[model samples]
Each structure stands twice: as structure tokens, then as C-alpha cells.
Target chain A: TTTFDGPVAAERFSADTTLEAAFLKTTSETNHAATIYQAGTSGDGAALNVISDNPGTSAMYLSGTETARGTLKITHRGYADGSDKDAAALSLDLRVAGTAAQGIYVTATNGPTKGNLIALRNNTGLDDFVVKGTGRIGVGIDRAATPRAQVHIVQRGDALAALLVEGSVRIGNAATVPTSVDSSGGGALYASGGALLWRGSNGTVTTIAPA
Target chain B: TTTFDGPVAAERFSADTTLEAAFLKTTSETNHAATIYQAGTSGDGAALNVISDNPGTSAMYLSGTETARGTLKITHRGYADGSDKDAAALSLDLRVAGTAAQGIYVTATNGPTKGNLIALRNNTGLDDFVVKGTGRIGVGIDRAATPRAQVHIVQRGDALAALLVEGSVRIGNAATVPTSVDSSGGGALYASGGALLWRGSNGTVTTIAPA
Candidate 1:
């Protein structure tokens, strides 16, 4: 076995390499086998950069033995000069290797008032599926830029099909089925067995048979 | 220290081996700590094969630090020789270790003109829950060998309950409730409040009050 007690540096090293260091020197204990650090004065690029030329290979593969905790973590520093516009964070490209069908893509962008705008992209490369910052969800549609409702859905066609409530559907202020329809305004109330009671502008109720 | 500058081939390399070389010696720069490769003329199985004999241990454990992006990704090549049948792909077996309750099993069958058939199996090992190739979805029943409709439902018991659409139901081109009865027809239409409406072949409608 070979052992280097001091720091070592090299210009280039090739071939398959594994880092296995027993810092604790014990069988049952916490040990950091290897650690890579990139520290500098200021304006540094990426701490780690993994590149791959093979189409079927991944740039980085992280494995962890601990079950309760996480195997990999990407932490971000909030802000430097109390400004949230230009904060450092994590970014992942879904189709960075080659042009193919990708499942989901996530990206975080810094904003002034809000910390980050995290967007999730679906298989179609559309980011309107889900947005985290505003807590808005879009189904069968793209998320609105300025979301007015908490949950928004854009139907595929003009069918205008909405929610399917299992129980009774109540409209207006009255609870339970209202026995009397409001005659002040011209409105229509549908009764059982194809019977529709309509109140015209003259404030009179008229029962219209099922057509 | 034991060091080799050129390529080295070994049948197997056991234990932990750390290869630390400063490809970029400058501070605040990215570096690759380790790399593994399985290069050959063609048809290489896997770059890394993690084997585990222990019952409670996992062969590979992937963890992600980012909350939005997924930690694990499995990519599959469409097909070899441009043939859709018997294509190379990714298959996930939920319980290859122990025999117990397992959920979600996905598989793809080949067909160029008809496209791929992606079937999702539930914990009960039934593929009738959702079928993509046939575009048939089963809530309580597995899909039949030959599906007759877009959505087919199989009730567990004698209670044949189906869709409940609010408002009036329309049949044929006629409007308004028909009053007269045709005694010869065998068709029956259920009305509200337990009323039964029977129609005859001579276009006569009859209302039968609840018994």
C-alpha cells in the first residue's frame, strides 16, 4: 500500500479513479472518504464541472449509504450585498447530453422582491405545468404570467367542462334546494323531470317543459 | 506512491481507490476527482455494476440536493437497427429482492404504426387500471381483451351504477315530456321521484307512477 501524508498535486490524471480514504481509522464511524473544494478570492465560476462526450452516459453519479439523510445536496448562499437580484444558486439542464425526449426540467431564477422563481417543465418543454414561487398549478394549460387564481386550468377545447362535485351543487347564498326562486331578477331554475321554471324581465315565474 | 501514466486493464478492482490529480491547478477552478469508464469495440453492458448480497442494503442509492429536480434519472435508447420491436430500454423491477406488496410496474411493447404500448400496473399486479396503448382506462375492472369503448367500467356487484349527469337528459330529436303511452314497446326510461317512463315502437310515450 502507498500512503501520502501531505498534499499532492498533478497536471493531469486519466483512467478510472476511486477516492477511498479512511479518516476515522475505524470500522463503525462517520468518515469522509474524499472531498473536493474550489475556493478563491472572488468571481469564481463553478465549484465542480462534470462533462461527458458519450450519449448514453451521465456527467455525474452520486451515491449515498445513509438511509435517513440525503445523498447529495446543493446549497445556495442567499445574497451578498443585501440584493436578491443576482444571487448564486443551482441550475440543471435536462437535455444537456443530446437531443431527445426529456421528462421534466427544473430551473430557478433570481428576482428582486421574491427570492427565486422556480419553474418546472414537462415533457413538451413547457414550463407552465407548475411554478413554485407563486404556489400556482396549471393543468392542461400553461401557467399564467400573473396568476389571479390559486389553481388555474385551461381546457383543451370549448366543451367548458368544470369540476365534478360528488355531492349537491349550491349556487348563491341559499343552502339546500331553494323552494322559491327569486322573482326580482330575470332568472331560470331547473326542476326535476325536464321541467324548467323561468322568470322573465317582467318579474313573473313561468314553468317551461323539457324540450 | 504507486502511479501509472498510461491505461491499465484489470479484471476487477476491489475496495476503495482514490485518484486525485489537479488537472487545473489554479484556485477557484473546477476539477474532476474521479472517473470510471467501460470502453470497448461495441456492446458494453454497464459502466458501473453495483452488487449487494445483503438483504437490507441497496445496490445503488441516488440522492439529490436540489428540491425541484429529480435525483435519479434512467434514460433508454429508442431502438437498435431502427426497428421498434425488441428495443433496448430501461426496466424497473420494484421488488427484485424480497417477496411483498409492490406498486407500479411499467413496460413498453413495440409497434411502429401503432406506437409503443405503455402499461402501468398497480400494487395488485393488475394492468387494467390504466392502459395507454388501447386508450382504455379501468377504475374497478381490468381492461377486457377487446375494449369496446373509450372508458369501460366493471362494477364489483349487481349494483350497476353509472355516470350521473345533472340537468335534463335528451333522447332523439323530440323535445318536451311525452304524455301518451304505447303499451307494446319494451323500452323504459327512469324519471325522477321513482317514476318510470315506457316508450313503444309506434312512438308513443307512457308514464308509469311509482308502485
Candidate 2:
């Protein structure tokens, strides 16, 4: 027989410290835990599933830290070799068309070397996509590396062309030619009158492919 | 005293349907529900949190839907206006160094018009990035549109230059000239001895920039 000793909200046992009550609504908890459910070694583990009746507010909220740097951490322990053993997935079901919504949005305004907008890297720590604090983009490059272009592409393999296209390529508009070349080694290749032409840094024009 | 009814695992009450047992676990539930927890209008809602002690296997598993088109759905209803309000995030935390590990992996092998690998669009129904089944990529175009090249960039805005670079550009190769221009049309620009030269399809060469 299980006897109750505390108030009616919670039923406590004689071995309260070890066995404890089913629910505890204390004004102050020594462990500072709002809820703690532990399944022993021989158990199927503790599972908490939440259902929300309304979406006007966040179903789950986390705020404040107790001398810690962050709010939440899901750390995987041990190892597995199951084919179905991927960690997990948080999927968003977009049944309707979004008018003014964003699938994902991130904003970071830390200046200089302090903030990096994004760093997409492989498990071996090879960076493939990086966006720096200065809004420079790196394709197949590192965020810390000095980029020579706003969007720099670093070729890692020799099998593929630098850029591949299955269709037509239009670089510059047809009617324009440089009146004066740029001092910083300026040049461009364009197609004009069925001929491929080049306008070089020294204000000279040359035909590459004639009609 | 709450006496046991059929078994000792779960305790049941006389008012079973409306106020039933703690756990029912029948051979075949008419509702086909393993567990269902509902909090009324004056409740804090139902929450489910799962913890895994071993990473060798999936802590949570799902298999074989009855008649539905997919496995899971997280639909958001209603609205809110909080600075902390957003859909959600799928964050992969890689604490350890990975070897031959990918942060996210997706594969599709349907041919021709059957499969579109990826389509990254905006809320206004404008497509910015698209990859088609034919392995053609559109940087700022639609997957359905015929690409002029393998990787087609559709510039929607007029402010920015076609391409911007702060470093040097190397095209063609040094010490090489075209043997014969292709009838379809071919041309190339190269640098030799501080001069920019062009090889045209008309069996002629010219120097646009001289040393």
C-alpha cells in the first residue's frame, strides 16, 4: 500500500528522498530543477513529447542561464552501426504557399574579424562555403583565408572545368567598348556582330572570333 | 484503496472510458494509438522530451505509415509578434573532428523531366537557385527554363557588375595558340610578355595590349 503524507496535490512516500513524490511543486528546490525524470539502467529511458493546441506562441521557450554560456545542448553519447542511425531531423511542413515568409533567416553584424556570417564545412574540417563578416563569400575556401574576390571559387579537383555551362553565356552587353582601360589591369571579352572581341587594359580592341 | 483490476502493471478505475486506467495497452486499440495525452483548455499543454543514453542506435524510431503519404508533420497555425518568434531551426552540432562525414546529405537520381534535385526560392515565389534533373544549375533562374549554359546566372538586378574580382584572372594558357578555329565559332584571349593577345576564328591574331 502507498500512503500519502504531504498535501493532496502530490502523494509522497515514507522513503521521500530516494523514492520521492510523483510530482513536486516546491517554492525552492535544492537542485534547482523544475522537473527531473530519470529512468534507471534497466529502463527504456525517459521520453517527453509535447503537443500544442495553439500556435500563437512558441510551444517551447528557453531563457536565462545559470553561469553557463548557452541555453541547450543535445550531446550524443556512445556509438552505433545501424543503417537507420542518423542523429535526428527537425522538419518543417509547409503545406501552404508563403507570401512574406522566410525558410531560414540569420543576421550577424559583428564588425571585422569578430563575426562570421556562415561557415559550411565538411566533417574533416574542409570548408566548402564561407561568408565572412565583411560580406565576402568563399566557395570551396576557408573563411579565414584572404579572398581576392567578393565571391572566390577555389578549385579542389582537376576533373571538372572551372565553370561548366550547357547553354549560351552572355558576359557583357553587345554595344559597349571601353573608351579608356582601367589602370588595375581591366579587360573584358564580349561578342559583337557575330565576332568575339576583347577590350584590353591599354584601350585597344582586338577581334577573337570573326563572323 | 485503489485495488488492482486485471494486472499489476497499470491501475484502472471503474469509470474506464472517460476516466480510464493509467495505461491501457490492449492487443489492438481501435484508435491505433500507443500513447495519447491531452491537456484541456486550462492546461499547460503536453510536452514530450526524449533522452538517449547510447548513440549506437536511434533513440526514437518510426516505421511504416498506415495510409498517410508521409511519416511526420509539424504544421504551424495562427500567428505571433515576438522578437524571439520564428519557425524553428535544425542545428547540427559537430563537437568532434569528423572523417568522411557530411553535415547534410541528399541524393536524387530521377532522369529527364521526372526529378528536380533542388529549388531554393524566396517567399514571393521567385526562384533564385535551382538545380534540374539534367544536372543543369541556375544561379538566379528557374529549373524549368532552358539554361544557356551548364550553370546559368540570370541577373535580375542592374546595379551590380556582371562579375567582380579583386585579384588576377588567368584565361586560356601561356605559349599556346589555336591551330584552327572551330566552324561553330571560337576565340580566346591570353597574355604573353605583358601584352594581351587575341586568337580569332578568322585565322588571324592581334595584340590588344602591348608591353
Candidate 3:
């Protein structure tokens, strides 16, 4: 412990000591903390400032690569013990009118081809969802890096629809309904019942087949 | 400062202390630290564990509701000073092959009516994207709490298209192209060069009208 004789109070209490394993600070023998803080009043500017100005560098970086181990893990003690409370591990609250704020942004500006910004798998190791580097998406589809469609959806088995829209699926902004099959009316396609029906500008209905 | 006479080294130096503004440990007043640790080696179980086990509770929670204020804010200081670092505020990495692991999980099991699991707005307060409590999604659509379709997409005025697929759009799994407009091919529609084409069972093409 070093003492200072600074003119101001803030500068006099700045400690950058290296406390080895032998250092101990306790209120009592039963409870211990490495370090803790209790901010008295809510205000702005009193933040933990980590200032580092190196290119492609992290102020704090953590990497854990081991079997059955997590790089970072968080679990509420009550979640296991059954004292259920309305708790969140992480809460990103932005309470202002701001310009182009992203809660979470993933960008790999220069990476390998067909990389993924986000990918998720199920317990059975099934590919659930993925957002590929090519700006393509896959829902329950194989993530073999060869996404044929922009939004490719694949159902494992026994699913209602690979892509289900509970309400109407309208294609294009066709204002008119056709009077006849060959009539000229700005065309629009909408799903009704079990069929994809067409509405024409002049107003008429045509019978289409399976799918 | 307190000391214990534990048999093992781990139990001897567990410190639970209250260091107020007056407490300072400084190598020099210019370089001060509240507390710091340096782990020489890596292994399992050597973790920062926060144990709190009550149902529906978070070990650590943060909330900021003041206008133009953010509860949790992170910026790679270099971004502003022009150092331009490839740093991330949070990185959820899973190296080992695991089961049903979520990079991020959001569950508002009992939120208010038409609650949003995830919602984002632009600088103009225009709704950008949202995942609704009703399991619906809206992209570039007005989020008025009433979603019309399962996947609602709306384009603002003077846009090319609300949705654009840079690649081909194939509807249904029709193995072969249509032979005739009235013939059986199990039916499918595809878009090619500004036309929505139909392929028949006998492998023929039909001319369908506008959009």
C-alpha cells in the first residue's frame, strides 16, 4: 500500500497495485469478494472507462476452447434452485431517439466465401436457422454452404408447410381483379383456402392446379 | 484486511472487503487500479462464478429507461479516435460440438398483449424489423401491434421492391416441367427474366399474365 500527497482528493486515492494470491480483504470470515462496487445514485458519466487505441485489438478478450466448457457462461442461481423471478442475463435497453443504432451487429467485412453471420442448431444437431455470408437465409435447411435460394426453407418431415403464412400471401401490388382469364387486369396472386388464387384488374377468377 | 489459517492455499486468501473512495492501491498515482487478476495458466473450473439461485432471477441485471440514454453502452474507443479496431463488445463462441446451445435466447413467456420478443426502429422511428410475441415477423412494415400476415413485409415509397431475391424463385417441388397448361405435372411456378413461368407434367411452358 502506497500513500500519496496529491493536492486533489481524486488523484490522491488512485491505486494501481498488484495484489498477489496472499492479499485478502473481508468484512467477515464467512463472505469474501475479489472486488465489488455499489454506485449510490443513478447518473451519467460515472462509467468504467477502458481506453485502448490499437487497431484490431480488444480491450478485453476471452477464449476458452475445451470439451464440455463454455467461453462465457451465465446462469441465475435461482434458475436451478426454483426461486423464479423476472430476471434477464442481458438487457440491452436503448431509451432514446437515435440514428442507426444496432442492438447487435455482426459484420465480417472480409472473410471466407459463404460464411455465416449467424447459425443455430438443435439438440439433434439439426440445422435450425442460418444467415449466410451471402445475405441468404436457411430455415431448417441443410447448411452445406450451397444455399440455392435466397430464403431456402426445408422441413425435416411431417410439417404443415415449409413456409407457412397464416394470413393471405399477396404477390405484387395489383390493384385490379381480372374480368376473364384472358382479360387485362393488373395481376396479383394471393393464397386463399388451399390454393394460390389470382386477382385481375378487370375482375375474374381462374382455376389453377396443384401447388 | 483479514487472514485465515486454512490448510489449502485457495481458502487462505478469499477476500470480501468494502473499499470505499478513500481506499487506493497505486504503483503510482498516474497508474492506479481498483483490483486486477492475472491467471498464469488455463484450465477448467477456474472461473468467475456468481451464485444466486432464485426462480426467474438474473444474477446481474441492468436497465436504463431515461430518454436518450442507454443502460449498457460499449464502443471500441478507437472507433471514435480513428484507430479502427476489430473489437467486439460481446463474443459468444462455442468451440466444442454441443447440443441445442443458443448463442442468445429471448423468451418473454408472459409479456403484455402483442408484446415483442425483438423490435428495432430506425432514426426516423420507422419500424425496421420485429419478432412479435404472436410468433409473427415484420420487415420494413409498420408495427401497429396488429400483424396482417405471418411474415409481413412493407416497402416505403420510392423503393425498387419490398423484397428482392437476387437469384431464382422456385415454388413447389415439381420434378418435371409442364407438358401443357391443362396437363398434370404436380404444378409449380418459377420466376425467370421478368416472367412467372409454369412448367407442365409433359414439360411445356405457359404464358401467365402480369405478376
Candidate 4:
């Protein structure tokens, strides 16, 4: 058992290091373990880093307390102008031993949360999509904030213009599409513009002029 | 070099401490690092905390391996009675230094995943929206699970109804608005209520009752 109030610097420790505080442990038994506090005063860098030297080991495993609220906070200082790619303010790289998987990242084109954004990239390192803090989303394109529609989609040459639904599509005040015309019953089609067309059960079409 | 087979207790460390294991390192070189495992048995508590006293530094920097999947999982325990607000089971705050930008939080009102819900709040600390694991969403209101609509919205006072379209609105079985009204060529308006109205090219109006 050791207690040091001041700072302790070690080049290396050959065995497993366990930290415990009496206040954090709720039970008298050894199974009760709680908090790890890493405080930084004058540094501009990260407060903690969990890195692994072996390719098979996972860098960090975070599990929250079942009885109490568990929180994780990540913040970054303002970024320089035109910072892009690897120079992003905050970057999360998901990968295998030596190769890269799809990644999640956060960056500010100008200021924090102003032009600040979070992105999900593909295995090829290309940003497949992004969502801005201000409620803007982009797919395959930057500058997603300029659209008036809630969802504005822009695609390259010759692609589909809008969404395609396999089933019936409905819009406006009504919850469903207008009543379907029964081919066997023979019905009249009324045009709001004033022309009335009638179709017979046998397939004949007749034009009914406005009164 | 010291090895403890059982439990090691420490009140504090006066300096920076580094823990390394032979199994955690991949190669003889320093860069081939891999894993950190924090395990708790029979008891529930946070696996780690990256805290800072200076408020300016980031608490944690999580960079995953490049070839494997990088994932973030958040879990919350069941809440007491009608636990709400600060008494939440899980909370995630997005802040700048000490100021909050937005927060993503989770809480269980009565049960888990049933009464369990997640919320997204603005800097004002008010829950602007929320979603349940059962696939229900609420905007500007709670109790969204009661409605069958995918997105249920509720406002305090008289606000603009659900939606507003600048152009024509269509409903029922039709694809577009009941054909546009033509001035030079009059058209008929069909009402599902069994009434038909007509306007001539000269602007005369006439009504046709149901058969």
C-alpha cells in the first residue's frame, strides 16, 4: 500500500498497476473499485492516452457503472484556418492491427461548432457523409448548409434526381393517396381545371365539357 | 520491478505513471503497441475516467486501430420511480471548455429500453427532442410513444400546423394535385364527398350533386 500526495514520475513499471481510492469504493471488500482522475493544469495536450504496443490488444475498454451515471466528455480547442484531413481538430480512427477501418471524425472548418462538423468515412479514407452541429447533413458533398429543404440531395451526372419508393407515395393534408379508380366499375375523372373525362368499363373514353 | 498476484492498493501517485505489459506490446519497437484492459468482477463501476482540472484540456483522445471496427457503446441502468433530469442513468454532454454546446443523454423513467429513452438538448439545457429504443421520436414534447406517427410533434401554443408546402397539396390515391385549374380551359374538381364543382373557360361556376 502506498499514498503519494505529490507527483510521481516513473520511466516504466514491470507489473500491473492498480489505482484505488477509499472514497470511490462503496464496499469494504476488494471488489469495490471506482474512479480514476487524471488532472492536467498547464498542458494544452490530452490528459490521458491508453495505447497498446501489441497488434492483438485493444487500446481502451470503457464500461460505465451500473448503479450510477457514467459520462465521457471530449473537447478540443479552436482550430487554425483551412485545417482539413489529418489536421482536423478531433479525429477518431477505427482500424485493425495495422490497417484502417471506416473512421469517425470531428473538425471545424472555421470555429468550434460554428462550422464544426462530425463525419463518418469509408475504408478508403473518403468522407462518405457528415452532419453539422447546426443540423446540416451532407452526403458526397460539402457545403450542405445552403439548402432550403430539410433534406437536400445532390448527386453527380446522370444519377436519379429524387427518392424512389416501391409502394404508394402520399403528400399534403391527406394521410393517403387519393381514392383509386376502379377499372371494372367505370368512373368519371374530374379535373380541377374544368375538363371532365369519363372512362367506360369496356375501355372507351369520353370527354365531358364544363357546364 | 514488482508483481502482485492479488490486489494492489494505492492512495495516490505523486508523478506521471505508465503501465506496460509484455502481452500488450506487439513487437520490440515502441510503435507496435496494442491494448489496455480494465475489468471489474461482481461489482459495477466506471472502467476509466479522463478528468482535467484546467478546463482547457481535453479529457480523452480515443484513436482506434485502422483495420478493425471502432465502436462506441453507451449503456444505462434502470432508473428509480420517475427519475428525470440530473437523476438520469446516463448522460453525455458536449461542451466547450466548461460551457455546454449540446448534450446527448439517456435515462430510464421506469424500465430499461421500455421506459428507457435518449434525448438531445441544446445549450439552453432543455430537452429539445428525444428518441426511445422502441423507435419513437418526440419533438418539442414528451410522451411521444402514444402516437402512431413516426415523428410526433407537440407545441405549447398556436403554431403553424404540421407542415406547409408552397405549391399544391395532394392526398388520397392520386399522384399529383387534382389536375391544375386552367384559366383558358376550364376543369372539374372532384370531391370524395360526392360533390362535383365546375368552372367554365369564361369563369362560370356550377355544382353537380351525387347520383
In angstroms, the error of model 2 at A55 is 22
Candidate 1 lDDT, B73-179, residue by residue in tens: 33343333333232222322222232221121112112111211222332243443432232323334443332222233343334434333343221121123433
TM-score of chain B of each: 0.33, 0.46, 0.40, 0.27
CAPRI docking class of candidate 1: incorrect
TM-score for predicted model 4 compared with the true structure: 0.33
lDDT of each: 0.31, 0.38, 0.38, 0.35
In model 2, the Cα lDDT at residue A59 comes to 33
Docking model 2 quality class: incorrect
**DockQ comparisons of all candidates to the true complex:** 0.04, 0.06, 0.07, 0.09
TM-score of each candidate structure, all chains considered together: 0.31, 0.44, 0.40, 0.33
Tens digits of lDDT, candidate 3, A54-148:
33333344443322323233322223332232332333433333222235644333333333555544313334455665677665555344455
User: Poorest 10 consecutive residues of model 4 chain B by lDDT?
Assistant: B156-165
The sequence of per-residue lDDT tens digits that candidate 2 reaches over residues A153-195 is 5555553443332222334234444354333366755655546
Q: Which stretches of candidate 1 lie over 4 Å from their true place?
A: A1-28, A41-45, A56-60, A80-90, A96-98, A105-211, B1-26, B29-211
Query: Where is the poorest 10-residue window by lDDT in model 4 chain A?
Result: A169-178
Chain A TM-scores, candidates in order: 0.37, 0.49, 0.40, 0.28
Error of 1 at A26 (Å): 9.9
